[PDB]
Design an enzyme around this catalytic site. Structure first.
Site, PDB file in Angstrom:
ATOM      1  N   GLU A 132       0.181 -22.135 -65.094  1.00 22.78           N
ATOM      2  CA  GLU A 132       1.294 -21.826 -65.990  1.00 22.78           C
ATOM      3  C   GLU A 132       1.390 -22.835 -67.133  1.00 22.78           C
ATOM      4  O   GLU A 132       2.481 -23.225 -67.556  1.00 22.78           O
ATOM      5  CB  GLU A 132       2.611 -21.765 -65.210  1.00 22.78           C
ATOM      6  CG  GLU A 132       2.977 -20.395 -64.735  1.00 22.78           C
ATOM      7  CD  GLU A 132       4.258 -20.396 -63.933  1.00 22.78           C
ATOM      8  OE1 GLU A 132       5.146 -19.568 -64.223  1.00 22.78           O
ATOM      9  OE2 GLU A 132       4.381 -21.233 -63.016  1.00 22.78           O
ATOM     10  N   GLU A 174      -1.540 -15.785 -57.605  1.00 25.73           N
ATOM     11  CA  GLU A 174      -0.337 -15.632 -56.805  1.00 25.73           C
ATOM     12  C   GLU A 174       0.294 -14.289 -57.122  1.00 25.73           C
ATOM     13  O   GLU A 174       0.297 -13.842 -58.270  1.00 25.73           O
ATOM     14  CB  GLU A 174       0.667 -16.766 -57.030  1.00 25.73           C
ATOM     15  CG  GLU A 174       0.710 -17.343 -58.421  1.00 25.73           C
ATOM     16  CD  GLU A 174       1.565 -18.586 -58.479  1.00 25.73           C
ATOM     17  OE1 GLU A 174       1.017 -19.689 -58.276  1.00 25.73           O
ATOM     18  OE2 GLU A 174       2.785 -18.464 -58.712  1.00 25.73           O
TER      19      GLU A 174
END
Length: 1209
Positions: free
Chosen positions: A412, A497
């Site tokens: 991220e 994820e």
């Protein structure tokens, strides 16, 4: 300063007797230097977290992401000396982790600094120590300024610490690299090829000739192959690499189902003599990430059934414990997991070793953030000067591990969409490649998510970065799994994820509605898997997106284990402090989606019913059974309800799987609830039964059961045993909603490391002896000590039968030898004249943690022992060994009358229990139906407390209750007005002097030019605080409603909200039963307040508009009751029908010790005008017997205690 226990081991533990102190009142000056005096500081064993011990603070700089657990600056100090046997050789201090910005001093000088938190770092200590034998002083500052993370992290030295003692010629820190180049080709020859590279650092003052011997030991210590190198000179004060090669005939490949490993031992040889030795266990295994065929191991295709996991261990805090991590890994492996994606920080050594033993893949995450910091004090602050060092450290440490399959580089990252970001990614991959090459690199990216429904075009720089790395991982981007495969065939993709969905154990709200990031009143989430965050999905969707695609290497479910902090559905809600993403709660208890994944990923048959069976009568309930069987049918109380089934589907390339015609992966029913037993039977396609499961309606709470994960633990001072404290009914069925408070008492050769329940919205401190059960269970953690022996765990709850369980602690040496370690004690409770049933065979626990079911002979039991109320112990024998068995028996029940007391409203019958519990002096709590004689109004006509007889169904003697009196009784209807009344007094916080206060019950509302009955608080100064009215009554009646009629004008506005309080006698108490409709600028509003003691009832209102006042035309409050306001504290006290010697209101205990053979005494007491007193007899041989008074409206209570015990015999 004691000396370190060095005797020849290369690495020495250093966790003993540190001293710690947190900064609470400013910087502690001078702690760095030896001259400081720390004698007042607490001693401590090293591996620990000092944030988990603290209380949750709402105002703490630790935002809700960090769990509100405070951080700050902490100091460690250890004083020590060095034995002579260790004098004269290289000494280096190795830390495995210190959370932030730790600066370590030594002998009053700076030894170094290390910003990053999760990497092991070392310092060369050899010169700085005192060779005189004088005591050294090591200090380790930690500066964890709190706003420094996105998830709970802990603080302080949360990982082990060792000293490394070595010859001046020794292997480097990680100076060994074992590989198997071209093993894929080699295995076809049934021959593995091993290449060894070694680094030797010669710290001596002169160059010396050096030689190496290396040996390959199988798993059982049998020599496989050995090698020796040609002697070659080693320069002075530098590193001289070596290299060797060999072969292993018939290698045993490492694999998930057979995690076999080899051991390598190097022996540095100087002058034909060993001078240093080193060990690294490795494994031979080949894996290939394919862009089309997907992941495969040793030539076998496989899916990466993955799970993201944080470092936090729950009740233990961030502190690492070998068995805590091993237990997490074992639970995951039980779930059918294949890989673990260690999230956003490098793994701990224990996690790597547990993965190697259990056979789970690992993915190391370097950083959560590059240069741009995600929190003010995050690692991004130091990234520029330390990224290379940290990547080097992680890869160097983990390179030899067989489990690690992929190095990750970020997650991220904000900078990923910039040119400088691409430069940084290229630098990072270059640094990773500078050490390791037999593992793909990886980055975790989310910016491609877009709208979740269409294939998002890729950002300019993101394609560059995805081309830089070897394998690409996507966050929550199932909408790109196949599209990017088409648009970039060379790419190798996997789900970094997925399925971010929130669950809570045992909670089953909203059976049919699928929400998204919705808060709830109870601060819980549904285990139906109907709830998830906006950017996530239900697990069914995320798993379907993955199963269908061959080229996708797999996915990693977000958060297998619930971790502290990051309560995403409840940002800024103080009680919520934990995640909900886990498939297993913080304690380790699996939530039903655990069983869903078990059904989907495991091979063996299974079945599990989702909802408990304690609902209301007659309502339909959503029951769905996870399973991998072809057919399942419910059987409720012996009658069937429907045989559901799957469809034997097959994917495009021919992967079998099971699913319904609709497209759901689980079977479902809608059953009208009926108490009983609901059993599900799984049957294969041919109809044969394959597996079974059941769920039963739990009765009332009866007893607290304790079960241990394993009853044999090593006496090494750190081995753990996890004990599940679950509340059960009489039949032994866990109550599916119990939440009582459990108190744990542990004694023996161990201590209570931590206690837990797994409730995310509970701020009960982890490090304590007591913990409320949640959804019928709680966890207690016991850790052994250095001394062998036994650990006794005792758990008890008010009004429930306690229980005890023993944990046997054996020596590390004995652990490998199957020898008797202990025999469990048998607990039995029976009624009077009930013969206990002693088992014919018993469990015998050996060292090595196995074996059971040995036969026994039990010594005779006299009738006198059990024919009367009391306690006694029974002894027996065991044929396995000479250790004496043992068994305790309790004989207690119902004999005679049982009393009770209570207070009640006027007119309405007292709220009495129709199943009143029968307890007696030295007896037990036994519940049976009690018919309280129909109570009329007239019983209140006489002063004091009136008695009522309760007839019991199925017992000998009858119960009784003494209800406090309120005298006059009456009922009324249509009380809307009175000609003139003395009851309705009114006093208010403020009344406008031009407006009357008694207008609120004039009987007619002023909506027009009629006489203006209106209270008002208009003033020149602001009144933003609002106003309240206190109403008094002397009318002994019931209250059932509260009608508020509002008036507004250019100065006044409507009430914003309603809050009401009442006091009987002295102190205020709050009102319930609101039922308030929407508050707005409207004509009407309503409430349904229940009966309440109303000596004065105060209702406060805040103006709806800031800068506007309040006005009311009427407020309908009718009646009042007096309950306990006029009472006082304890008045009378007696024991054995005599005055209690040593009694006193304030004395903390009365020393009423009894001669042996004198039966326990009866006690009677009362309060002035009969305040409610909890009359309880004495029931324990040890301890005390205590009396308490309930006074006022619960705002105070008084304590009395008696020292009941028997003297020496």
């Amino acid at each position: 300063g004691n000396s370190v226990s060095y005797d020849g081991e290369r690495r020495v533990n250093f966790n003993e007797n540190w001293r710690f102190q947190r900064e609470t009142n400013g910087s502690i000056a001078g702690a760095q230097n030896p001259g400081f005096d720390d004698s007042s500081w607490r001693k401590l064993n090293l591996p620990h977290d000092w944030s988990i011990e603290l209380d949750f603070n709402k105002n703490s700089l630790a935002t809700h992401e960090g769990g509100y657990l405070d951080g700050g600056i902490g100091w460690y100090r250890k004083t020590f000396t060095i034995p002579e046997s260790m004098k004269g050789k290289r000494i280096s201090l190795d830390f495995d982790g210190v959370y932030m910005n730790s600066t370590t001093y030594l002998n009053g000088e700076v030894l170094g600094t290390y910003p990053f938190g999760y990497n092991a770092f070392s310092y060369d200590i050899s010169d700085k120590l005192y060779k005189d034998g004088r005591a050294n002083v090591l200090v380790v500052k930690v500066n964890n300024t709190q706003p420094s993370s996105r998830w709970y992290s802990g603080s302080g030295i949360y990982r082990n610490v060792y000293l490394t003692v070595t010859d001046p010629i020794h292997v480097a820190r990680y100076g060994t690299f074992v590989t198997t180049p071209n093993l894929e080709k080699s295995i076809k020859e049934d021959r593995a090829d091993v290449n060894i590279k070694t680094k030797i650092s010669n710290d001596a003052a002169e160059a010396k000739q050096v030689k190496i011997k290396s040996t390959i030991y199988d798993g059982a210590g049998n020599t496989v192959q050995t090698v020796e190198t040609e002697e070659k000179t080693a320069a002075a004060g530098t590193v001289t690499p070596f290299e060797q090669n060999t072969v292993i005939k018939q290698p045993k490949l490492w694999s998930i189902d057979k995690p076999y490993r080899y051991n390598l031992v190097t022996e540095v040889i100087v002058g034909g003599q060993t001078v240093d030795t080193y060990e690294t266990k490795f494994g031979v295994r080949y894996f290939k990430f394919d862009e089309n065929e997907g992941f495969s191991l040793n030539g076998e295709y496989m899916k990466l059934h993955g799970v993201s996991m944080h470092h936090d261990l729950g009740a233990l805090g961030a502190a690492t414990n070998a068995r805590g991590v091993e237990r997490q890994m074992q639970i995951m492996k039980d779930m059918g997991v294949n890989a673990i994606r260690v999230t956003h920080n490098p793994a701990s050594p224990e996690l790597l070793e547990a993965a190697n033993k259990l056979g789970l893949f690992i993915i190391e995450e370097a950083f959560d953030s590059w240069a741009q910091s995600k929190k003010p004090y995050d690692y991004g602050r130091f990234f520029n000067a330390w990224a290379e060092h940290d990547i080097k450290e992680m890869v160097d440490r983990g390179k030899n591990e067989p489990a690690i399959i992929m190095w990750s580089i970020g997650n991220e990252i904000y900078d990923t969409t910039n040119a400088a970001g691409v430069e940084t990614a290229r630098n990072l991959v270059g640094w990773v490649k500078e050490i390791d090459t037999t593992r793909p690199t990886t980055i975790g990216e989310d910016k491609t998510r877009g709208d979740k429904v269409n294939v998002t075009p890729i950002n300019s720089y993101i394609k560059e970065i995805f081309n830089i790395v070897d394998v690409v991982g996507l966050n929550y981007s199932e909408n790109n799994y196949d599209g990017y495969h088409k648009q970039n065939p060379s790419w190798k993709l996997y789900g970094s994820e997925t399925s971010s969905a929130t669950r809570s154990r045992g909670v089953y709200t909203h059976p049919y509605q699928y929400n998204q990031s919705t808060k709830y009143a109870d601060l819980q989430q549904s285990s139906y898997d109907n709830d998830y965050v906006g950017w996530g999905r239900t697990a069914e969707d995320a798993w379907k997106y993955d199963r269908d695609l061959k080229h996708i290497a797999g996915q990693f479910i977000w958060t297998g284990f619930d971790y502290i902090g990051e309560p995403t559905p409840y940002y800024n809600s103080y009680p919520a402090k934990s995640s909900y993403f886990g498939a297993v709660d913080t304690a380790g208890f699996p939530k039903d989606i655990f069983y869903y994944y078990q059904s989907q990923w495991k091979k063996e048959p299974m079945v599990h019913l989702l909802p408990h069976w304690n609902w209301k009568e007659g309502e339909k309930v959503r029951v769905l059974a996870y399973t991998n069987a072809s057919k399942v049918e419910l059987v409720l109380n012996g009658e069937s309800l429907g045989e559901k089934n799957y469809d034997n589907k097959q994917t495009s390339w021919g992967a079998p799987y099971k699913e319904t015609k609709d497209g759901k992966t689980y079977l479902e029913w809608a059953v009208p609830f009926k108490p009983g037993k609901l059993e599900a039977v799984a049957k294969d396609e041919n109809g044969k039964v394959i597996a079974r499961d059941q769920v039963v309606t739990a009765g009332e709470p009866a007893s607290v059961r304790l079960t241990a994960d394993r009853k044999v633990v090593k006496a090494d001072g750190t081995d753990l045993s996890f004990i599940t404290a679950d509340i059960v009914d009489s039949k032994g069925i866990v109550v599916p909603d119990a939440d009582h408070l459990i108190t744990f008492n542990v004694t023996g050769q161990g201590e209570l490391a931590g206690v837990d329940n797994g409730n995310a919205s509970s701020v009960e401190r982890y490090k304590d002896n007591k913990r409320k059960a949640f959804s019928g269970k709680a966890l207690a953690i016991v850790q052994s000590s250095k001394l062998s022996g036994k650990i006794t765990v005792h758990a008890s709850v008010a009004g429930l039968s306690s229980d005890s369980t023993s944990v046997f602690t054996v020596t590390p040496a004995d652990h490998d030898k199957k020898i008797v370690a202990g025999i469990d004690d048998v607990n039995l409770t029976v009624d009077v004249n009930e013969a206990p049933k002693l088992p014919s065979e018993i469990k015998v626990y050996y060292s090595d943690e196995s074996a059971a079911a040995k036969n026994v002979t039990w010594d005779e039991v006299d009738p006198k022992q059990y024919s009367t109320v009391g306690e006694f112990t029974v002894e027996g024998s065991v044929e396995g060994t000479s250790l004496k068995a043992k068994a305790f028996v309790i004989v207690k029940g119902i004999v005679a009358v049982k009393p009770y007391s209570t207070a009640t409203k006027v007119g309405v019958q007292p709220v009495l229990p129709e199943k009143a519990t029968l307890l007696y002096s030295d007896g037990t709590t036994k519940g049976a139906t009690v018919t309280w004689d129909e109570i009329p109004e007239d019983k209140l006509a006489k002063e004091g407390r009136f008695t009522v007889e309760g007839s019991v169904e199925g017992t000998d003697l009858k119960a009784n209750v003494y209800v406090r009196v309120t005298n006059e009784v009456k009922s009324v209807n249509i009380m809307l007005q009175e000609q003139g009344s003395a009851y309705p007094k009114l006093e208010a916080t403020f009344t406008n002097p031009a407006d009357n206060l008694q207008h609120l019950n004039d009987g007619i509302k002023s909506y027009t030019n009629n006489p203006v009955n209106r209270w008002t608080n208009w003033t020149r100064t602001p009144r933003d605080a609002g106003d309240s009215i206190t109403v008094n009554f002397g009318k002994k009646h019931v209250i059932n409603n509260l009608d508020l009629f509002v008036f507004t004008d250019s100065g006044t506005v409507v009430p914003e909200k309603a809050e009401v309080q009442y006091w009987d006698g002295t102190a205020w108490k709050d009102v319930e039963n609101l039922t308030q409709p929407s508050p707005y600028v409207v004509e009407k509003n309503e409430l349904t307040f229940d009966a309440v003691a109303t000596e004065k009832l105060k209702f406060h209102l805040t103006p709806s508009v800031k800068g506007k006042f309040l006005a009311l035309t009427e407020a309908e409050v009718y009646a009042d009751q007096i309950v306990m306001g006029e009472t006082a504290k304890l008045q009378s006290i007696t024991v054995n029908g005599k005055a209690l010697e040593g009694f006193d209101h304030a004395k903390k205990n009365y020393e009423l010790v009894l001669p042996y053979g004198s039966e326990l005494p009866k006690i009677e007491a009362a309060a002035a005008d009969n305040a409610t007193v909890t009359i309880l007899p004495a029931f324990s041989y040890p301890g005390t017997a205590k009396l308490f008074v309930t006074s006022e409206d619960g705002k105070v209570t008084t304590e009395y205690s008696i020292g009941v015990s028997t003297e020496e015999p």
